[PDB]
Design a protein that fits this description.
CATH architecture of chain C: Sandwich
Strand order of the largest sheet of chain A: 1-10-4-7
PDB class: virus
CATH class of chain C: Mainly Beta
CATH class of chain A: Mainly Beta
Largest interface: A-D, 75 and 73 residues
Strand content of chain C: 25-35%
Structural class of chain C: mainly beta
Oligomer: part of a larger assembly
Radius of gyration of chain A: 21 Å
CATH topology of chain C: Jelly Rolls
Chains: A mainly beta, C mainly beta, F mainly beta
Number of domains of chain A: 1
Protein name (chain F): Genome polyprotein
Shape of chain A: globular
Subcellular location (chain F): Host cytoplasmic vesicle membrane; Host nucleus; Virion
Number of strands of chain A: 11
Shape of chain C: elongated
Family (chain F): Belongs to the picornaviruses polyprotein family.
Radius of gyration of chain C: 25 Å
Keywords: beta barrel, eight-stranded beta barrel, replicate in the cytoplasm, Virus
Amino acid sequence: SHSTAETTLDSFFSRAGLVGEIDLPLEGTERKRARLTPNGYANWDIDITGYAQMRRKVELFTYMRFDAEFTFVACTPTGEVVPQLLQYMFVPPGAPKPDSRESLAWQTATNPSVFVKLSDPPAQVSVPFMSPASAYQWFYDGYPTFGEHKQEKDLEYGACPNNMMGTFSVRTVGTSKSKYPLVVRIYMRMKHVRAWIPRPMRNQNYLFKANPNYAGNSIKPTGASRTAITTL
Amino acid sequence: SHSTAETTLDSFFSRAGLVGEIDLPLEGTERKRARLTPNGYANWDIDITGYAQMRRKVELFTYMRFDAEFTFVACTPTGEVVPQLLQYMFVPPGAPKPDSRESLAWQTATNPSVFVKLSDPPAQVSVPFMSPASAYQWFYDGYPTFGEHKQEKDLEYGACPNNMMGTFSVRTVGTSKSKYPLVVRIYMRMKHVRAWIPRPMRNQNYLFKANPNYAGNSIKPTGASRTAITTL
Amino acid sequence: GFPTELKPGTNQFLTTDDGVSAPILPNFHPTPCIHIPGEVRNLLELCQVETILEVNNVPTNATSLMERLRFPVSAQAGKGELCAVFRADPGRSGPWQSTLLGQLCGYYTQWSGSLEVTFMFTGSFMATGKMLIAYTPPGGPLPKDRATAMLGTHVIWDFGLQSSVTLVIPWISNTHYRYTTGLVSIWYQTNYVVPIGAPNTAYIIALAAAQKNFTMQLCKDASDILQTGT
Amino acid sequence: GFPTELKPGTNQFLTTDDGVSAPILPNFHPTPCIHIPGEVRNLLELCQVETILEVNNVPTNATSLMERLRFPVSAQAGKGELCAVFRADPGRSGPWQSTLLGQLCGYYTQWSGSLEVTFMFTGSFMATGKMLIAYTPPGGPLPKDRATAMLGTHVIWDFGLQSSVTLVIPWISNTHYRYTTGLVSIWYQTNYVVPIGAPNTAYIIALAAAQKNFTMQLCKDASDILQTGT
Amino acid sequence: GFPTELKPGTNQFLTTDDGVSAPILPNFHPTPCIHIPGEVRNLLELCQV
Amino acid sequence: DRVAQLTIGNSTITTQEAANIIVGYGEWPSYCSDSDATAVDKPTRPDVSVNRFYTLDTKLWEKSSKGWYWKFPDVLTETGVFGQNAQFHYLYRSGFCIHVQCNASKFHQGALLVAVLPEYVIGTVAGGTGTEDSHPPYKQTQPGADGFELQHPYVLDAGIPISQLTVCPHQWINLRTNNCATIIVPYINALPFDSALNHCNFGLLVVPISPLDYDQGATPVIPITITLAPMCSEFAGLRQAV
């Protein structure tokens, strides 16, 4: 034995994973369109669980803190590259997202935008630790809204809005629709990771994104033995 | 908290905003052509208020001083990129602008020009602080022409010609018209910002670019209460 | 022959990217700076300046717009509540939008710090009486009466002291914003007292600003208008 | 004019490449770290924490799932074998999958080091008796009887000592995996002895963890699920 | 904004070119060298046998 | 022969048992030298009145008990003077000395796992076989001083394996060996202060891992008594009316 660096949180967490994949077709008899339901422009909220194995992984801890490197690989659904100009716009948590291709949100300077071609190598940017709190939080045993208690007209329980990281709004530049069917795949890499309160690793299938709900058909991590006394 | 750097003038003012958008189509039955009405070449005066929110922002102060970084993103109205060679020519304030595609102004060396392709990444240049005065001036309580006084049949009050920053003349290189419909979008980022006399922030809708005129329907910043004694 | 590999995201144009681009006029020498008496280097300087707080944001007539900068007492009133109150929410819709601080918060997303509110009594010299200015922290409801308002943080303001009442609001926060605000109530401790010849109604002007521990975070352009090309 | 040749593999995007990319918000200053009481900096900290070892991975009913964390003795049994040998195979299918150690190995390819397994007797205070705990190194077969198990590495555990039996497994390795595991056996040295009034059946809880010499190598994501989009 | 001109023979792949390329597994730590009794560092050692 | 007294309420106790006292994450509760402005109206640090020995109603352990949990500070949120402070303040911060004790004979049997899990979010059933997202009521998320019983101890009612609950601050209560357990909890949050009534910083789990047993004739239910004392409780906020 010599080095234990592969079990640091950075080794464990840091590599670019395929988070989402935006789909931008042409016009015709196809459906749906979409996607993610852009009549001509997609809004994608930053969700680190876009990468499948990531949720169970990060839920090993209660609090986390990190930067994020985003990379944008764009092509036609055949993987062809075509001369099209794209806009990747970052909408910070507090800001309003575009609701159309003609939305004023697209020209709002405080939404940093990236203007890159498909012929250009994939775009790449860094997002800092965005929370108003001191750390992200995959578990919030309570109710964020501070009203007057005995009132839960909502089963909102367990959500924490301090984890909002922002939004990426994808678009082909121009006033007219693009001549090419496009796909934009978003990759994310966690950078400066710190984690705090370790907890048991997810034991059952996930049912919902926002809560630890499980099905009444509880299952074991594994039960291969016919009896404690045998081993085959 | 720890740092107050986001409220410095540079943080407040410095990011590339979409100032203007020059439009260059082909020939046929359309209207208008234009734009900004070029029978084959566009002249665009540097107007920092091209970006909508920018005027109210800078009018927080009376005097300002800065550099400007301009970026030119060019494409077809579909956002397609095409093999076209462009000329962006900077016409310094004192200089005569081109009046045709054949103007000698295009070859006047003291008008710095940029020759870049659409296939090339967007062009980028910096314009220095251009005023003959010590600072720019969003408010000029007086009359720039110094003739002799009771002489006012010219609507000039309030304008300052010392703020002239120059002109960008956009054009496709060549003696023959371009084969492609083009759009040139101009972005500006203020760089080394200093500001001097703070003043109340614009309270009413703007009516005109050159003066603070307002309509007789004066409106309040907001009056949501039905009375001071309630809180809805 | 210096070996080089171009990394992902080269030919991209990021609108917030801060690099050095080619100067258009290398030989041009800009007019040198002279000294100009006022200068601002950080917006927090402006946030620390008292501006008029439109507590009375009730009339919407062009001719009654000046009435939002004041709010009166009067000998008419008993010993109940003068005016309910501006949630200590400098960035939210309401009275605070009249202040430079509120308008500067409109260009940002998060803020945190302490606030000062100065109340100025512009009544007659001969006028006298006591008001109870009370602060109710977030989550709490408006105190039902003067008596229960008195049990919390409050200042009893007499008109032997003209305006030298500055209420200080301990802490404001946007850990959530992207009854969760403070409450600064004003009550009649006593009725309004005047001799013969003194007006039976007087007005208070409220001025507000942030303290030096106040900071704002995420820049964000929101707006009203700017003229179209015609 | 600085001369440059672009080397093979420029415009490529390598998902594991570690470079510095353009900050999307150069002027943004993230909320400063406060101190949070628990912090982990290396997963090996978690591998060193005893978690319950489901030696009894036999029942598969929702109502009987809690029975896998225990495994009993009883006065019934003679002097033969209590329960077979959880192969000392923290990364393989079986009992070890209940432990945090086993689940953490699932995110890696290779591991090597020593292991501890603590057995806790949760019987009556009045209960007494001796168990023989034996470890069999890889390649070796399960010892045919108690007598031949005694000839190897073993601990004789009496209930004058509650749980202070922690068996140490010398070494585990994955030089091959991408009878080749250790073997830990539990035998009745003596029968289970109780007086009148004491339950004739008691349960043992097994806790396991890795020692500080334990290391894992090649990172590798394996999984169960995560919810689909609707 | 650092000025650069790309010289002839950039995008070429020379099979004898010796540069440094991106590591596929940056966080991976290879099994450390142990001592092995025989070692050769130059083929001329074998020519002399 | 030892009687430990702190305040107005007094308790008789054996300590320190099999494994001494467990200090969660090796960190004692502290006041907050750091947070946050700091302003004049800043925290109100009471004791020893508020920070006293609170003893909850005893729970009865049965052969069939699945386990219980409590949420902090929700348990004391309506109890005595601490309950008063937590309700009529805006910001809250505290540590806790949690003490769990059994009374059983040398002829009784069993093992409890006593653990502390920060941000203990509950998940209920979505149908025995199905996907209906219903979220737990207040009676289950914030069960008050009376606590709540686990429906599925194996998954800690949150799809999370109890076999690994020992990653959390814990102490075993093995009737054979010891009858009591003590856990010390520091304030744990991503903020220095939070809402006492809307956020439960942690949950306290008490789960039988080895079931209670006895021959018939012995007392069929074993009492589990819980005494807890806040340690560096800190109340900012100010005035409030619920």
